[PDB]
Design a protein around this ligand. Structure first.
Ligand SMILES: NCCc1ccc(S(=O)(=O)F)cc1
Ligand SMILES: OC[C@H]1O[C@@H](O)[C@H](O)[C@@H](O)[C@H]1O
Ligand SMILES: [Br-]
Ligand SMILES: [Br-]
Ligand SMILES: [Br-]
Ligand SMILES: [Br-]
Ligand SMILES: [Br-]
Ligand SMILES: [Br-]
Ligand SMILES: [Br-]
Ligand SMILES: [Br-]
Ligand SMILES: [Br-]
Ligand SMILES: [Br-]
Ligand SMILES: [Br-]
Ligand SMILES: [Br-]
Ligand SMILES: [Br-]
Ligand SMILES: [Br-]
Ligand SMILES: [Br-]
Ligand SMILES: [Br-]
Ligand SMILES: [Br-]
Ligand SMILES: [Br-]
Ligand SMILES: [Br-]
Ligand SMILES: [Br-]
Ligand SMILES: [Br-]
Ligand SMILES: [Br-]
Ligand SMILES: [Br-]
Ligand SMILES: [Br-]
Ligand SMILES: [Br-]
Ligand SMILES: [Br-]
Ligand SMILES: [Br-]
Ligand SMILES: [Br-]
Ligand SMILES: [Br-]
Ligand SMILES: [Br-]
Ligand SMILES: [Br-]
Ligand SMILES: [Br-]
Ligand SMILES: [Br-]
Ligand SMILES: [Br-]
Ligand SMILES: [Br-]
Ligand SMILES: [Br-]
Length: 138
């Protein structure tokens, strides 16, 4: 139906070492023309807390442009009631060291409405993806 969510790895290449600037790991598009109050992304499994987890066992924090992180609630959220798509990127900060391995994210997107000074979920979707960082030519 009207609710839609698309979570994908970035369509380009990520290279190992110190990131020379903020680097997008994943894109998140979500929208609904039906009435609603906002959206949240809840990291699940080993991503709990807002992390990617690498095949080497390292946790790397992710940041959002469009959403705000609330650690109390293990979620990013944005309050938006418009019918237009929200286009966000989850990124790693400039200077972050990445290793040439696979980094995974798993989470759940929820769309919610407001009532009784709180909120109620009206739709949800599990999302996941991975980026395999390349060494680059040496
Ligand atoms: N940026 C919001 C997600 C998040 C929250 C906390 C960390 S950590 O370093 O603690 C990493 C990432
Ligand atoms: O304003 C609504 C938001 O409130 C935050 O405190 C919560 O973590 C989000 O999930 C969302 O419900
Ligand atoms: Br969908
Ligand atoms: Br998806
Ligand atoms: Br979509
Ligand atoms: Br691609
Ligand atoms: Br790739
Ligand atoms: Br680079
Ligand atoms: Br997307
Ligand atoms: Br509609
Ligand atoms: Br979980
Ligand atoms: Br290692
Ligand atoms: Br770590
Ligand atoms: Br953030
Ligand atoms: Br936090
Ligand atoms: Br917090
Ligand atoms: Br609380
Ligand atoms: Br949770
Ligand atoms: Br607000
Ligand atoms: Br707010
Ligand atoms: Br749109
Ligand atoms: Br947007
Ligand atoms: Br963005
Ligand atoms: Br680092
Ligand atoms: Br390594
Ligand atoms: Br309310
Ligand atoms: Br009510
Ligand atoms: Br109320
Ligand atoms: Br709530
Ligand atoms: Br709430
Ligand atoms: Br609920
Ligand atoms: Br639901
Ligand atoms: Br699902
Ligand atoms: Br997905
Ligand atoms: Br993927
Ligand atoms: Br290789
Ligand atoms: Br390397
Ligand atoms: Br290679």
């Amino acid at each position: 139906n009207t609710f839609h969510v698309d979570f994908a790895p970035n369509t380009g290449e990520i290279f190992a070492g110190k990131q020379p600037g903020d680097v997008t790991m994943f894109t998140l598009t979500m929208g609904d023309t039906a009435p609603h109050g906002g959206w949240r992304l809840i990291p699940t499994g080993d991503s709990k807390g807002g992390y990617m987890i690498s095949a080497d066992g390292d946790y790397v924090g992710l940041y959002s442009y469009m959403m705000s992180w609330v650690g109390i609630d293990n979620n990013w959220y944005i309050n938006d009631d418009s019918p237009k798509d929200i286009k966000d990127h989850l990124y790693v900060k400039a200077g972050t060291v990445l290793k040439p391995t696979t980094y995974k994210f798993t989470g759940r997107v929820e769309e919610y409405v407001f009532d009784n000074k709180q909120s109620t979920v009206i739709n949800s979707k599990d999302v996941s993806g991975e980026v395999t960082v390349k060494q680059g030519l040496e």
